[PDB]
Amino acid sequence: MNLVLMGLPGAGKGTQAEKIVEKYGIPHISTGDMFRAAIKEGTELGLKAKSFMDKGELVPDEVTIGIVRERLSKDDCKKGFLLDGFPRTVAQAEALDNILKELGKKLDYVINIEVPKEELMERLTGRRICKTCGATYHLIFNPPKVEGVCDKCGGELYQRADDNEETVANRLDVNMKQTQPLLDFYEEKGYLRNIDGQQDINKVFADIDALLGGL
Numbered sequence: 580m581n582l583v584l585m586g587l588p589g590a591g592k593g594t595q596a597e598k599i600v601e602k603y604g605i606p607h608i609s610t611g612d613m614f615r616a617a618i619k620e621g622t623e624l625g626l627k628a629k630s631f632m633d634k635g636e637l638v639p640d641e642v643t644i645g646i647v648r649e650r651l652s653k654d655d656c657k658k659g660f661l662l663d664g665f666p667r668t669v670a671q672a673e674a675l676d677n678i679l680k681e682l683g684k685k686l687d688y689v690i691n692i693e694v695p696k697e698e699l700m701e702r703l704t705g706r707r708i709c710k711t712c713g714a715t716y717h718l719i720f721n722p723p724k725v726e727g728v729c730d731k732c733g734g735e736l737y738q739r740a741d742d743n744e745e746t747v748a749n750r751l752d753v754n755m756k757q758t759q760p761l762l763d764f765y766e767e768k769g770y771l772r773n774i775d776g777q778q779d780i781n782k783v784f785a786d787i788d789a790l791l792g793g794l
């Protein structure tokens with residue numbers, strides 16, 4: 580099961596990834612998580628990635644493609660993987676097509692979670708994230724059981740630094756620009772599937788899981 584999740588910032592990629600992982604346990608490969616970890620530990624690639632992230636810009640394609648190519652070469656990706664947030668440019672999609680050729684592999688689906696851009700700033704500025712397990716919640720749209728507390732592991736919820744209004748405006752503009760050409764690229768391959776991201780979280784997943792049924 581070789582999958583890509585795509586979607587504009589705040590459409591609900593991470594939320595659906597956790598469900599897909601919870602049910603199928605395929606590795607979750609998130610370029611955002613990889614960069615964020617690189618930052619936590621002060622590698623030079625991490626420190627250079629931070630300046631783009633802080634501004635809501637994309638990290639350059641060469642860097643991103645390099646780390647994905649190395650990550651997909653591991654034994655845990657031999658039977659399946661869930662790419663989350665990569666590709667997000669056509670150039671990344673071309674790279675991925677060729678990385679996969681090198682490995683003797685092919686994508687099964689690119690799952691695009693669609694939500695109108697005009698709803699998305701609200702989704703990110705109100706997001707709260709578990710410090711321990713990374714599960715996400717939203718103060719209005721999807722709150723936790725107890726204010727301040729993750730329902731999964733009990734950890735404390737924080738605001739991600741790039742979920743600032745100004746950074747969010749730039750992330751939506753940057754990703755909007757990249758999205759239509761990427762959609763066209765995969766629509767031509769035949770394995771792009773669009774999911775209505777406006778529905779409730781379980782129903783979105785239901786729609787995704789209809790596709791994943793043939794493992």
Ligand SMILES: Nc1ncnc2c1ncn2[C@@H]1O[C@H](COP(=O)(O)OP(=O)(O)OP(=O)(O)OP(=O)(O)OP(=O)(O)OC[C@H]2O[C@@H](n3cnc4c(N)ncnc43)[C@H](O)[C@@H]2O)[C@@H](O)[C@H]1O
Binds near residue numbers: 665
């Ligand atoms: N490939 C690449 N190339 C170059 N640079 C790269 C890169 N990948 C990453 N980067 C760099 O790293 C940065 C961060 O990238 P990354 O971490 O990938 O962020 P992103 O793509 O902006 O996605 P987000 O995590 O913001 O949103 P999400 O859709 O996953 O939302 P969630 O499920 O939490 O949901 C959002 C909110 O909505 C809520 N919610 C979700 N679903 C629903 C629903 N159905 N109903 C109600 N509320 C919902 C949630 O509770 C939550 O509060 C980039 O800006 C860039 O700088």
Ligand SMILES: [Mg+2]
Binds near residue numbers: 594611
């Ligand atoms: Mg995410």
Ligand SMILES: [Zn+2]
Binds near residue numbers: 712733
């Ligand atoms: Zn948690």
